[PDB]
């Protein structure tokens, strides 16, 4: 319900190759800081048994409260051990994912500076 409608937010439904896709998702998060990758268990949501038994890999993408992408059971069309770059290319082919380094930090009344006598 929260957060801006102009930021693409995707969620993952999992149960305990989930580990490889989680690693790829972590790599994408490190590569796309503006995105807010997150995951949640199906049992927490309490989805249907068919989804639990035959739809374990879920790639759910939300954009402004509506489903712009509902990739479910991505085993067949993506694989089992493909790397993060493959997932990035697959997701960017559909135009869904968005298109220097400081020392550590710079950020910290409105009187900036005035030398006027």
């Amino acid at each position: 319900d929260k957060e801006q409608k102009s930021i693409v937010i995707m969620v993952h439904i999992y149960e305990d190759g989930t580990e490889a896709m989680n690693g790829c998702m972590i790599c994408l998060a490190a590569e796309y800081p503006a995105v807010k990758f997150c995951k949640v268990k199906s049992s927490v949501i309490g989805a249907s048994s068919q989804f639990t038994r035959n739809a374990l890999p879920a790639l759910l993408i939300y954009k402004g409260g509506e489903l712009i992408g509902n990739f479910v059971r991505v085993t067949d069309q993506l694989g089992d051990d493909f790397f993060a770059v493959d997932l990035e290319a697959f997701l960017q082919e559909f135009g869904l994912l968005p298109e220097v380094l400081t020392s550590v930090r710079n950020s910290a009344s409105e009187d900036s500076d005035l030398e006027i006598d």
């Binding site: 220097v100 380094l101 400081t102 020392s103 550590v104 930090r105 710079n106 910290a108 009344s109 009187d111 900036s112 500076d113 005035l114 030398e115 006027i116 006598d117």
Partner: protein, 532 residues
């Protein structure tokens, strides 16, 4: 009978809940008061770690549900915004005042009488502070500022290194000093750009006699050091020209497309030529710079920095004498760039700081500016140093603006408690209890300091009260008004002589804000909580 879709609390229940919430908020931060106080660690739900001693930051980061706790948190935030120091003392005093007022109410004293007594006590405390406990800083000199900074940086990660950090703070504040109309010396803090970078120890923190940018040159071909810098500050991007929404290119004769495309970039090229023709060496812009313009700057042997922060650019322009130009348009409908809009600096260098680089505009002319580069062991340490440094800068600004300071270490609190408990006998019949409770509540600060120091709080506060009572009764013992608490040895000590000062505005604002918050909470005797 009410048929209101929600829960209702009335009478002693809601008052007790409000007081419990305020006391819980107080107890959250009571352990970070005074030099013997200790910091806290705040961990988010995503693992982010924050280590701080500042009360306002702790209360902002926490999640608060009860409305009275929200009131106290916003009270701390307001105290930080308006003063910058004492954000914990105000919360503690407000909670103690609320607790004592609630006890009075439970004693069947009407809350209006308690509120009137609190108002009278606050007014008399402010008057007594302004008339007896202030120390003029004219005859103390720079040592007063040094001691105030050291006192403000006690109980912080930079406490022991105060001998050096206070010098840094005082130098920066005096460097950013300016005078305004009607001859008021104004010190615009937040003009000191605080830069953080982990690595070498705290003692290697550098105070820049100029300005520091957290950004590097756009291209690797440009020189990274210019001696006689002619800084040009711009507020427009330097890239390929593109027509606006209302302008469209329609080609009917194909022979003109090449000329159109050439002019498209030649416009920016000629703008850069006009800018460079005046002798500019350093070019700073808030917008971006593409490749060809970067090459244009490279060939001329001049710096070019993109995506400069607007506030940083404004500070650089003010310090160096340059003026920000959002466009190259004069008053006769032409494109031009005179040398008068060029700032000057003694040196501009891209220094390396712990595997990272930043630009140091050193020794700007026509105005003195300062910046601080903080070096710490890790990111959390640097953040805490930045917070403590900001608190010290605010304290020094308050001391320089208003030239009155008061002794620290609970001396003001004890003197106020004695004076108020003596004064309460003079006016009213039911308000005297309220003023006595105000005086008792004012004693929470030295008690908390002694508790944090793991000393005998009862005996120490008794000795302090005896000293201040002797000072107030004997008219030849006025020298005892400065008797504060020496937390290191756990004994009373002349804090004014020992160099423990703080701005009078801190105490005045803390008292006023705490009294108003306690009054606001005290009026509540009924709660309706509608279900969502």
């Amino acid at each position: 009978p009410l048929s209101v879709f929600g829960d209702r609390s009335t009478g002693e229940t809601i008052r007790s809940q409000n007081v419990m919430a305020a006391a819980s908020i107080a107890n959250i931060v009571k352990s970070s008061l005074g030099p013997v106080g200790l910091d806290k660690m705040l961990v988010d739900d995503i693992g982010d770690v924050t280590i701080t001693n500042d009360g306002a930051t702790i209360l902002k980061l926490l999640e608060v549900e009860h409305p009275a706790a929200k009131v106290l948190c916003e009270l701390a935030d307001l105290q930080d915004k308006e003063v910058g120091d004492g954000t914990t003392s105000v919360v503690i005093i407000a909670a103690e005042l609320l607790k004592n007022a609630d006890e009075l109410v439970k004693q069947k004293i009407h809350p209006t009488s308690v509120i009137s007594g609190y108002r009278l006590a606050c007014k008399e405390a402010v008057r007594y502070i302004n008339e007896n406990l202030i120390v003029n800083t004219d005859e103390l000199g720079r040592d007063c500022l040094i001691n105030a900074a050291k006192t403000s940086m006690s109980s912080k990660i930079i406490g022991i290194n105060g001998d050096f950090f206070a010098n840094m703070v005082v130098d920066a504040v005096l460097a950013i000093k300016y005078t305004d109309i009607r001859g008021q010396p104004r010190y615009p803090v937040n003009s000191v750009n605080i830069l953080k970078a982990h690595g070498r120890s705290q003692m290697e923190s550098m105070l820049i006699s100029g300005y520091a940018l957290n950004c590097v040159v756009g291209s690797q071909g440009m020189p990274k050091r210019i001696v006689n810098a002619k800084i040009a500050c711009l507020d427009f991007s330097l890239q390929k020209t593109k027509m606006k929404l209302g302008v469209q290119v329609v080609i009917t004769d194909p022979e003109k497309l090449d000329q159109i495309r050439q002019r498209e970039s030649d416009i920016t090229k000629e703008r850069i030529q006009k800018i460079l023709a005046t002798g500019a060496n350093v070019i700073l812009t808030t917008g971006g710079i593409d490749d060809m313009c970067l090459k244009y700057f490279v060939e001329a042997g001049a710096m070019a920095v993109r995506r400069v922060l607007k506030r940083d650019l404004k500070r650089i322009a003010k310090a160096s004498g340059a003026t920000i130009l959002s466009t190259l348009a004069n008053l006769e409908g032409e494109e031009t760039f005179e040398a008068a809009m060029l700032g000057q600096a003694e040196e501009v260098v891209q220094e390396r700081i712990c595997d990272d680089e930043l630009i140091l505009i050193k020794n700007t002319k026509a105005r003195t500016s300062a910046s601080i580069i903080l070096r710490g062991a890790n990111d959390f340490m640097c953040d805490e140093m930045e917070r403590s440094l900001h608190d010290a800068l605010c304290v020094v600004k308050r001391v320089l603006e208003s030239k009155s300071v008061v002794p620290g270490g609970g001396a003001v609190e004890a003197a106020l408690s004695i004076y108020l408990e003596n004064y309460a006998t003079s006016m009213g019949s039911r308000e005297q209890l309220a003023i006595a409770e105000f005086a008792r509540s004012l004693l929470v600060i030295p008690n908390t300091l002694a508790v944090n120091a793991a000393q005998d709080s009862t005996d120490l506060v008794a000795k302090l009260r005896a000293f201040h009572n002797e000072a107030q009764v004997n008219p030849e013992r006025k020298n005892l008004k400065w008797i504060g608490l020496d937390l290191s040895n756990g004994k009373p000590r002349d804090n004014k002589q020992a160099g423990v000062f703080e701005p009078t505005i801190v105490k005045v604002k803390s008292l006023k804000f705490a009294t108003e918050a306690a009054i606001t909470i005290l009026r509540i005797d009924d709660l309706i909580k509608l279900h969502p």
